[PDB]
Design a binder for this molecule. Structure first.
Ligand SMILES: NC(=O)c1ccc[n+]([C@@H]2O[C@H](COP(=O)([O-])OP(=O)(O)OC[C@H]3O[C@@H](n4cnc5c(N)ncnc54)[C@H](OP(=O)(O)O)[C@@H]3O)[C@@H](O)[C@H]2O)c1
Ligand SMILES: NC(=O)c1ccc[n+]([C@@H]2O[C@H](COP(=O)([O-])OP(=O)(O)OC[C@H]3O[C@@H](n4cnc5c(N)ncnc54)[C@H](OP(=O)(O)O)[C@@H]3O)[C@@H](O)[C@H]2O)c1
Lengths: 223, 223
């Protein structure tokens, strides 16, 4: 069992999350950010892969003071729980996640992560250890549920999106499709990793499509 | 100068044209095929990369007898011109393109293609030679225009889509987004090749979005 899980990502018209240089580029405008901010404020937790933390160093904070005050007035942290999937415990001790905002941090690591680096992280985050050499996402999802995380927003990363989807852990997939072509066989897509074969394709159902600023927001139910 | 050029492709919700095994899978239903068939019947020419011919061996024919009869009654071939971008002249002499339907075939090759294989193709197609080691798409587009091809449908292939887009030859991009996740860092996307850097991103404008069967058809104007 697990929380309700949805992926929320912005991709170019050709399906890329960023350039081959893994440089993050303007895919969306203000209205799309507000929609993302609102989703963050609503979720119990936000999850991202270590690849995203290293490449972009995001805070994963709710930006609107009002949305933060509202969470606050509901007796919750100003920010939801912030989870990094990080097998080898590479999350830097001065990552922006640890610098900005109140709220719990969780680092999910594997049993093969450096025992001394864990200890350093345990000073500023909760560390959940799971899996042999890679985080066991199914197991992690179960523990997050048990901790009372009923809604989990995966802002992803190409490989983590794959991790979560191929493990059958996802309920819904939201893709803001921006008005640009990024290109490149090596640019990260909305779903990388190994890939499904013809015999394992994951079916979706379209729930909505909404033009927003210069792009379009598509939402699918998984299965 | 060049014909009016549009890319028409079907991709999974995560931007893939097919699986990592390069196996083609059901992305769309009947209505989407009818829309594709109508587009084929309307274009002067259809262009595909040699990777697609080798992987899928498509006929690139108009399937509807009525749409073929209508082209016919307008004094044209039942099928538009069928172009393969094929630097090394790998198009097989028994490819389905040569077996099915009337109409002109063109093979676009580079100046480094085997001189004897050209001759074999020239029996069943027109061969336009252009470029040193890879087909010069800009040059090709110019010759196709001169031949009176005013409308060119690129059904693509991941790498050819990149070729055409990065050469600035494309006016519009149509993507039927199907209700499935394919996944895989090595699965072909709507645009592979080298990829744009942050400084060379190609801007689009959304022209329409139309739910069709279980997917959604997005159309963009380039720039
Ligand atoms: N446009 C958007 O909305 C958006 C949002 C977020 C991110 N991004 C983009 O995503 C890009 C990076 O994506 P990415 O794939 O490199 O990084 P990622 O998906 O954020 O994280 C991937 C890493 O997670 C770790 N992991 C641990 N256990 C795993 C499991 N069971 N399954 C899958 N992964 C597991 C793996 O590394 P270890 O094994 O070393 O731990 C894996 O390489 C960035 O350039 C960023 O711009 C875009
Ligand atoms: N879902 C859909 O609507 C749809 C439609 C069509 C195709 N597809 C998929 O596309 C996949 C294959 O894509 P692909 O990238 O391998 O093949 P492709 O894009 O059809 O053709 C690529 C090849 O074109 C040749 N080419 C020659 N000059 C070029 C130039 N200037 N720029 C770019 N390419 C040039 C190159 O090989 P040489 O240098 O050897 O000539 C290149 O590798 C197939 O698996 C198929 O299922 C999907």
């Amino acid at each position: 069992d697990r929380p309700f899980i949805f992926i929320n990502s912005a991709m170019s018209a050709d399906g890329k999350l960023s350039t081959k240089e893994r440089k993050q580029v303007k895919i969306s405008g203000k209205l799309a950010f507000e929609r993302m901010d609102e989703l963050r404020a609503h979720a119990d937790a936000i999850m991202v892969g270590i690849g995203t933390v290293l490449a972009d160093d995001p805070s994963l904070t709710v930006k609107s003071p009002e949305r933060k005050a509202a969470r606050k007035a509901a007796g919750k942290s100003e920010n939801p729980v912030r989870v990094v999937v990080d097998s080898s415990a590479r999350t830097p001790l001065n990552a922006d996640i640890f610098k900005k905002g109140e709220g719990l941090r969780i680092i999910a690591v594997s049993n093969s992560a450096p025992e001394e680096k864990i200890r350093m992280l345990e000073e500023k985050a909760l560390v959940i250890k799971t899996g042999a050499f890679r985080v066991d996402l199914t197991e992690l999802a179960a523990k997050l549920k048990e901790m009372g995380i009923n809604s989990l927003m995966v802002e992803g990363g190409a490989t983590l999106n794959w991790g979560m989807l191929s493990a059958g852990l996802v309920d819904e997939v939201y893709t803001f499709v921006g008005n640009l072509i990024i290109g490149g066989k090596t640019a990260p897509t909305f779903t990388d990793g190994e890939g499904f074969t013809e015999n394992e394709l994951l079916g979706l159902e379209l729930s909505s499509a909404e033009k927003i600023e210069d792009g379009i927001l598509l939402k699918w139910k998984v299965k």
